[PDB]
């Protein structure tokens, strides 16, 4: 997207979201990142929304095909599952590449750095969902390491109700439950996160209260399923 203005890429990413054209949205936001400037809060969210939609569709398709393949056990189901899997891995590698070149290293404020490290954990987690064997082990450790660094920063630099801090804890708890085979760690993290946020709600405006309690309900929803 080298010939398009940064501001035009951002404007077109917003239009693509409205049109539910998420592959386009991700390509526009990749082009915007590759302009080399840091991203604002709104721009980071556009980048994340675009890729979460793209990879979310791929993950849903991979799960459908993997279920059919498991029930079957010609080569067609495996071949097509592998094709979708390779595409999914390519998108994850693209996002991880943007984070490594050079979003994370230039992110000095806690809000941006935690945001990008949470993304890094998420996309390694999506790689882990389809990985098999010892490659899975190193991918899992990469997700854990990214989430842990984000957690350490968020606990030092953000209030317990901050929505990015809450969403990070939610997703790290899912990592523990679904990827790392650590359901007790998942439950403990979700419970502690919820309780510390509850005790801080009194400091918030009406609008911030709505933002934080929406994510707290997601933590509670997981706790209800897990206990």
């Amino acid at each position: 997207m080298g010939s398009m203005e940064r501001a035009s890429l951002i404007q077109k990413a917003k239009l693509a979201e409205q049109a539910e054209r998420y592959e386009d949205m991700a390509a526009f936001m990749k082009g915007a990142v590759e302009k080399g400037e840091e991203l604002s809060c709104e721009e980071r969210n556009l980048l994340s929304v675009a890729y979460k939609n793209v990879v979310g569709g791929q993950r849903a398709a991979w799960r459908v095909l993997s279920s059919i393949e498991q029930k079957s056990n010609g080569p067609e189901v495996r071949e097509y599952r592998e094709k979708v899997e390779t595409e999914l891995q390519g998108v994850c590698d693209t996002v991880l590449g943007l984070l490594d070149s050079h979003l994370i290293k230039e992110a000095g404020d806690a809000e941006s750095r935690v945001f990008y490290l949470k993304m890094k954990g998420d996309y390694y987690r999506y790689l882990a969902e389809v990985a098999t064997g010892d490659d899975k082990k190193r991918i899992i450790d990469s997700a854990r390491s990214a989430y842990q660094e984000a957690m350490d920063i968020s606990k030092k630099e953000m209030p317990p109700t901050n929505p990015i801090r809450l969403g990070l804890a939610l997703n790290f708890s899912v990592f523990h439950y679904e990827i790392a085979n650590s359901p007790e760690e998942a439950i403990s993290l979700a419970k502690t996160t919820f309780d510390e946020a509850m005790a801080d709600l009194h400091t918030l405006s009406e609008d911030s209260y709505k933002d934080s309690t929406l994510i707290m309900q997601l933590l509670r929803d997981n706790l209800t399923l897990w206990t």
Binding site: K14, E17, E42, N45, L46, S48, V49, K52, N53, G56, D122, G167, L170, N171, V174, Y177, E178, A186, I215, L218, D221, N222, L225, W226
Partner: peptide, 9 residues
């Protein structure tokens, strides 16, 4: 188990 939906700005 649900992660952040994260699919709408």
């Amino acid at each position: 188990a649900g992660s952040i939906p994260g699919r709408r700005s």
